[PDB]
Amino acid sequence: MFNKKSKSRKLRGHVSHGYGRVGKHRKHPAGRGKSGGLKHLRSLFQRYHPDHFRKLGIVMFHRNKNADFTRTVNVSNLWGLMKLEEQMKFKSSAEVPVVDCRNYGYLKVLGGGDLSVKKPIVVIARQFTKDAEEKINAVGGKCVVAA
Amino acid sequence: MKINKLNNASKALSYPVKKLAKTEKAPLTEKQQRSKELKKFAMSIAREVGGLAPYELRATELLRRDEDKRCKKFMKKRLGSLKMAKKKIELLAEEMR
């Protein structure tokens, strides 16, 4: 629902506000923040967060996100990049489509699934998996590497 | 995570541009030549009027005894840079000759 009354409004008239008579509601009975984790809170850490207290891995003091950013597509989705009206033309037509993945912000092609239509296609990208290359060549298509 | 998917080989590719050659600036006009001459001249007069400094004397003395590696170490400690030391040794050597 888009709106509902709160619990606090029902607790008017009931002594302890739902915190108990014996236990009460004190200020900080367990400590502040995420502290105590090697000591009295060891059971919470070993159950939910086992890889917290450690150092790991190779270090580079400065990294650049733009130099490493990439996005991946599978062969089964190649025909899907085209508009539905465009798909329905190339399905019947005698011509071969020329699809450039760079134009949709994809740089690497993966070998997942089968091609939607079993007719030739030209695919342009920066990198192909070994499975992807074999699948495209199977239908008489061509893989073109480009920057 | 949309990071670290390409190999280093494919990241190194590049688009085939057509380059423009750099415009060389080798010609030096008459007035620029006289300007440089006068500055180099002035540097002579100072050396003639006031002579060498204490560490330059100590350095040149070692060069006469062929104490090349001692002189190298000495100059490194005085000037800080191993490059400045290599340059100053070459200038002092030429002065003695």
Place this chain on the structure above:
Amino acid sequence: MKFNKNVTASRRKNRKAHFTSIGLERTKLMNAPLSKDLKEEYGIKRIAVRPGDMVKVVSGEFKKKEGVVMKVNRHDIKIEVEGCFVQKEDGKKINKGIHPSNLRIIKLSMEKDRAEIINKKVEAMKSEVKA
């Protein structure tokens, strides 16, 4: 509707401006309508009531009465009209003050500067009316 944003529409501000008025702004509070005939004799539609002028009371206890203005109280905004009074237990009579807007002018007192005051207002109209 009001489209000028420099003029206030706050109840608190309008009320303070009324009661704390001084000088010429105070005189504007003492204006009354003229009768139909006088609005042909002179150009003006309304004037500040002064002693000696002749007025018909058009609202309140003393409705229908006519008389001469005796006094003008500027601090407590009221006019005293000849023959409008109440009698105390003592038999002593006290004039009761009437608010300017409940009066209407029947004859003008033309003593002193009144003729020049009227002239000044008529000219101010025509100056812009004829343009």
Place this chain on the structure above:
Amino acid sequence: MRGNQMLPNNHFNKGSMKFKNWFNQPMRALKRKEVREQKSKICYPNPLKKLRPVVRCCSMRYNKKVRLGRGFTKMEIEKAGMDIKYAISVGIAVDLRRKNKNEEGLEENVKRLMDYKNKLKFFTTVREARDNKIEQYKGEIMKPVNIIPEVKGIKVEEIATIYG
């Protein structure tokens, strides 16, 4: 701390921390509008904004996209037959720090200069323009678009010879 959560990390410890609210947003927008309007009167026939070059964006992530830059280089201006003092008088921006390193980048910026020169109109006095009822151009001048292109088709014999 109890139950399963992502471990907290909320940075509100520092008592000297300032807060910035934005209640002024609609009013400051209205002031910027009114300043542009009055500035536009002071130079009535002329556009409020200058002409700027087209450059290519920086990293591997943005190579394939073109953008506006700061100013034309002395070489671009000279190649289109103008001189620097004249270019300024006609509302072209100049940047003497930039260098040219490609044939393509130079050729495109020369086209912009020649196009702009052709679309201009000159007047003796302000009153002449006013009497002709000239309406002054607003916004940026000749901005790039960078749309997504369209899928080209090719005959099976071509596949062996060109590769898209």
Place this chain on the structure above:
RNA sequence: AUACCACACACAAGGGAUCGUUUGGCUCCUGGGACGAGGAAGGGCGCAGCAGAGAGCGAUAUGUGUGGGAGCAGCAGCAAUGACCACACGUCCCCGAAUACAGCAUAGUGCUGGAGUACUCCUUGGAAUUAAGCAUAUGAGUAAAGGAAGGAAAAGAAACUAACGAGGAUUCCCGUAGUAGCGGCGAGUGAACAGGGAACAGUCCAACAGUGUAAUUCUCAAAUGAGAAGUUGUCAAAAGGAAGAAGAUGUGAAUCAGAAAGAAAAGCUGAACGAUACAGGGUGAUAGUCCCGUAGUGUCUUCUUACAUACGGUGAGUAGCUGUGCUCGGUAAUGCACAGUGAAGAGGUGGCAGUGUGCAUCUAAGACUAAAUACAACAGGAGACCGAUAGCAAAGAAGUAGGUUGACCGAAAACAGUGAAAUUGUGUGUGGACCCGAAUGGAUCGGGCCCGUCUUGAAACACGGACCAAGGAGUGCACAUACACUGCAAGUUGAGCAGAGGAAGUCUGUGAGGCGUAGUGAAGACGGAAAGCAGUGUGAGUGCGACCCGAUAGACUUGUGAACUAUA
């Protein structure tokens, strides 16, 4: 129970709750940002026909000029020979930087000092607190204390990023990002380039000034002379303008009558009339036409702003190095200092120490700069804010009455409305602490220990509570989360910002980024299942005063005290 004690009801006392009202407060936005040796800010003392406080003003203590025009609030007297108001000017006692002074510059005249300091710049520099203890670390380069300036201040045109097919001063907004990293690798901390915008602007000095004559600046004279500064180096050109903005002020439509009733009609009833004006205020009850305005229209006054000469590639106790202390996310040194040592004319940099070598990009150790950005006093406009125990401490002579030896500390009180409860007197009734169940003409019968709270356990010889009114305690924001509801869906979104529009609302663009569309490893590298995004709300975790109240303590000040008491 004649008269005491209790309860109920009527009347009179006693108190000031409740309801109705408000020339005050608070918050947001816009303008403004105006002091002083020509004596300021702040303190004291005087001035009225009757005058204490407060307001106003200086021995001229209501004077002059301009524009208006009717009374001066009480009593006595004044006033078209100008009552009163508004704009400017003249006069302006004593103390106070307080100066017949101190320091300092010029040929000479002079300038500084004190006040204010919310916002900006430069120094100096804590502790409480968090780590469930505590010492490194955190709070925090924050508080406190000092110096300085303006309407803004600081910064600013690369000894700059980047490795792309590259860009191109500074500042500000959206974002990269709670990331790369720093850290008893604990608690916790934490930037930069890109990509989308607002606003846009570049220039000076030194190096390096006519030698057929310092051509340069100043003073007195004079109509063409004397003298000072300067060769340890002076001297490198334009008037000019209409636009733009803010205030002040003039004008400005249209109604009368009536039964009943009231102190009073503007209500109610009938008949009219205005509108580019039905925003709002005042009138003896609720008014378009009774009064002041409003929509629409005129005038006038201030302020802001604009054309000329000559040039380059070497700015030293500096950059750097060794030791040392502080600092930063900066990690085998990010920035800043001190002592030793100390360059080259060619040098600096490319987030990990060293040596060599190509390559790319820049030019330090001298200066100036608009716009876009921040926020007190004072002025103006608004509000789903508060309504006299609230809202500022302060709706009246409030930083006042009053108080400290001193630094410093600090109230109450609205309407001549309404008039509750506690509590008191008188009269009339009913009972002997009172409640629940059941009744009589009438004696009474049966059942019940004092509530709230910690606790295995309270009627307790456990604690809090004499009585009544009013006030009085799980809230707001950020970040992940599960559920319910809504739109679209391999996609999704109110980023900022632009265009329209009598406008803090709404509508439309342009257009980033983020998360999703499949995972595995420290990584090189490899790849093969699972609807999401953005909101409206609820339960719940963490950080901030964090449900409300409460320590003994710690630190910091260019703050105060030897009137009591100790000793010379």
Place this chain on the structure above:
RNA sequence: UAGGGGCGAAAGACCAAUCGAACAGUCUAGUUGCUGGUUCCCUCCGAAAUGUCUAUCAGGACAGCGCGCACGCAGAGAGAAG
């Protein structure tokens, strides 16, 4: 002669009814695993005072026992017979 300072024929005495570390004001609404309080009605369901680890023993966390929403569904705090 003034506060981590004074002054003392010495008692930790005295320094404005305050001294085994003065007063004023600020940081500061310092902190609290400890004591006190925490404001309307009816309907339905309904506990625990035990185990492991803890500078842990007047406190926590994890598990066990409540409630809400519930995809779904042959089971049972009892007997026989081997």
